[PDB]
Amino acid sequence: MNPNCARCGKIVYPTEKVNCLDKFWHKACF
Ligand SMILES: [Zn+2]
């Protein structure tokens, strides 16, 4: 039940918890 990127679709590992509004993305997916 891992957080998938709100843009690409892949799991956002705890390494790459991008801070948008309220959820998780990756670096280039911000
Ligand atoms: Zn992504």
Side-chain angles (χ1 to χ4, degrees):
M1 197 198 304
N2 286 307
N4 293 79
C5 183
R7 164 74 276 195
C8 69
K10 309 191 204 298
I11 172 178
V12 179
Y13 285 99
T15 204
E16 174 159 39
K17 300 180 82 76
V18 167
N19 286 100
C20 303
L21 287 52
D22 73 305
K23 61 187 73 71
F24 296 118
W25 316 71
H26 304 99
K27 180 174 171 51
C29 307
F30 171 81

